Amino acid sequence: MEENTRQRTENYISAKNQHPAWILLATRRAPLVLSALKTLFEKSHDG
Amino acid sequence: MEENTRQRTENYISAKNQHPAWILLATRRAPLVLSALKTLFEKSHDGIPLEEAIQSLSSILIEHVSQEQYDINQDNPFLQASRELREWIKRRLIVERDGRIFATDALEVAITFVESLDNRFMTSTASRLSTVQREIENLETRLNPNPANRVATLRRRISELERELQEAEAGHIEVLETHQAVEHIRDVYNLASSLRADFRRVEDSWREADRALRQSIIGEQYHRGDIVERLLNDQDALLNTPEGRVFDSFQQQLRQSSELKAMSERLRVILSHPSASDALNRLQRHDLRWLVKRLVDESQTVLQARARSERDVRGFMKTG
Amino acid sequence: ANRVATLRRRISELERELQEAEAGHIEVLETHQAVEHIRDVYNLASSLRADFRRVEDSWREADRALRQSIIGEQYHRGDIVERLLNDQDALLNTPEGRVFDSFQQQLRQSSELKAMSERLRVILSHPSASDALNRLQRHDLRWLVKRLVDE
DNA sequence: ATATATATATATATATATATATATATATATATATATATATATATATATATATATATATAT
DNA sequence: ATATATATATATATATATATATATATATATATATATATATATATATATATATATATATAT
Fold this sequence. Notes:
Entry title: JetABC DNA loaded state monomer (open)
PDB class: dna binding protein
Chains A, B, C: JetA
Organism of A, B, C: Escherichia coli
Distance between the termini of chain A: 43 Å
Oligomer: part of a larger assembly
Keywords: SMC complexes, Wadjet, JetABCD, DNA loop extrusion, DNA binding protein
């Protein structure tokens, strides 16, 4: 199980520097972008 | 409706600047803190006792002292563990209670997010659709009061179960093939783990309601006769809110020791099946094995925590 | 024998409920209990689409890898056919692949999915639905099956 | 014999100096979101030329 | 007679320039975060003066 301990930190760091979602939530301007995007995408479901 | 969008950006800025989970996610050192806390709390049944927390967190810090780019300490991992623990407590990210520290709701949300983030075994299994279908069946068949509808539903159900009884008696019973069974096991674990999800939201709601009551009590001239009823009406108002209502309904449902006895006996056999080891590793297997005890203990803890609010009335009404 | 006994007792439970209903003691969900009972269903459904969002990516990556390896010179015609078959089978045997396969089996036995969508229509017409869920969520839960079939 | 009153005993509360541990204000280093700039691409218009198809006079 | 071939018209493509919007890149000012001096709190050894008290003298 010890791998699950250390390798997990590398998983999290790679997610922090790569995954778009976590990158977005970290930006200084996140809430405006997130609110605007949800407003756009809530009212229509086909694109 | 989109008039609220103006208000929604304000709501999100407020959440960004206040909610501890989001602030944590935004920090430079976020992955280290989240990994350390996940490792620490993976083994908690109650709030982990403080001393155990310090020791095990020092060991975890030792695990990652190699990462010098994060300014990790290299003279006393025990002191570093204690310092980090108090720092996190200051961040409203973990709370002391009875000397046993617990994970606030913020950390639970952050951990669930980051865990769901990566490629992994996914949240839903192949059995999720069948679960939803069964639940929809029950919900619809119970929502409508038309007695003809209910009797027809029961007639078709009873005919189907008579078919199944005849089939099984004749000997054509059927069982889950291995890879179907593993998926069902995993879905069961995922459903079950959601019960713990909100034992910490309820306590925060109690805390805030009690704080609001005491704060409004600043206008002492109100009638204490009002509070002779407000003792129950606090719970009543939070029973108009989902928190108190659903938590107390959950308590009532959980108090039915017969169904819980059935659930425990069935958990035991499902976990004794060979594919259990396939579906779930050691940690998950133990966690599910005595989920019932976890729920009972932690709900008892929540009740004994709301006991302080129960005493709030004696701290308000009495002015000797 | 365990299955036989379980059926023997479940049949008696539904017999008890049938006796209660025929006597006139039909019981509805308490007009507040039905509220949370509905958002519970919505929460269960909330992950079903989320997982398909990753089934999509898994298959996209499989296709891209196959296309890239086709430009690979080392492969005979037989090797490329083998790569296609084995990549598809491997993708299908992963958890998300099993999600897709179960969805496909349900499509085969379409009666149950149609019944589910009919039940959803009935559920959302109830007044309590408006209290439990805002309109967008009700819309999503109504056309869950459509969304999956499109995805 | 029980009750008032005695010198000394139990033992601590308080006091001081000392160290170590923690909380704070402040300075300072690195990461960040954004402003400015040059080359690139887009589309616009103005004009020339190429092209297909036709009008007309012609070959045999 | 039928079909050939050139001059003609018109629909389309190509060249060129203007202006605008763009992408890559540099540098800037901004914010997070770490490090530090410093003050304050927690705990401790050593000891005093104290309150409570035993043990105790004295009394009716």
